[PDB]
Amino acid sequence: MNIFEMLRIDEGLRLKIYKDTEGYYTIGIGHLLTKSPSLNAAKCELDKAIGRNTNGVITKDEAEKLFCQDVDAAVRGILRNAKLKPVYDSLDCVRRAALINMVFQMGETGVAGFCNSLRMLQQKRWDEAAVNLAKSRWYNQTPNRAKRVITTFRTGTWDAYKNL
C-alpha cells in the first residue's frame, strides 16, 4: 500500500465531472475543479487542466496525471507550511501518508490549524492524537475515511486499507 493506492481508495476514480462530498465539481481521483456552482466554470477549469476541449470527460491516463500533480502539490504545500513541515518531518513514511491524505482532502490551511492534534502527533502520543483528530467536522462528515486515516496515525500501519 502507498499514498497513491491509499488516496485512490479514499477518492475513487470517475472519468466524468461529478460532485464531491461537499457538493463541488470534481473529476478523476478527487481532482477539485472549482467551488463555483456553475458547471460551465467547472468545464473551463477542466479544459485548462487537461489542455484540450474535454466536454466534461477525461481518460484514465489523464485522471492519473492530475493525481500525480495533486499529490505532489499536497506534499509541496506541507513542506512550505511552518505548522505542518515540522510535524511531517517528525513522522515515519506511513504516517506521512496519513498527513498528505488530510491535506489532499481539506487543504493545507485547514489541517495547519489543528494545533492540538498536530502537537500530539509531533509528541508521538498516538492514541491521544487519534482521539483528538476525531473531534472534528472532518470526522463527522466523512467518518469512514477519517477512521481509516486516524487508524493509520494511531498504528503506523496500513491495516485500515487492507481488504479495500
Side-chain angles (χ1 to χ4, degrees), residues 22-116:
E22 304 283 358
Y24 296 134
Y25 291 122
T26 301
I27 199 157
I29 306 167
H31 181 80
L32 175 64
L33 289 164
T34 179
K35 288 182 188 180
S36 174
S38 167
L39 177 57
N40 278 346
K43 277 173 176 294
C44 291
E45 295 284 3
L46 180 57
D47 294 345
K48 177 182 55 183
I50 305 295
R52 66 185 181 82
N53 188 332
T54 69
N55 194 34
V57 183
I58 64 175
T59 70
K60 174 173 193 191
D61 283 1
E62 289 169 341
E64 293 176 335
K65 188 165 184 180
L66 296 180
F67 187 46
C68 193
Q69 300 174 345
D70 289 349
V71 173
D72 231 0
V75 175
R76 284 288 189 162
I78 286 165
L79 297 177
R80 99 200 155 202
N81 185 284
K83 303 295 199 193
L84 297 174
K85 184 184 180 292
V87 184
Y88 185 81
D89 290 340
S90 77
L91 293 171
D92 58 273
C93 213
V94 178
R95 294 187 173 93
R96 289 183 175 151
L99 190 64
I100 296 164
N101 192 308
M102 293 189 74
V103 170
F104 190 106
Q105 182 180 0
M106 291 170 276
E108 160 198 344
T109 300
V111 184
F114 296 179
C115 71
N116 311 110

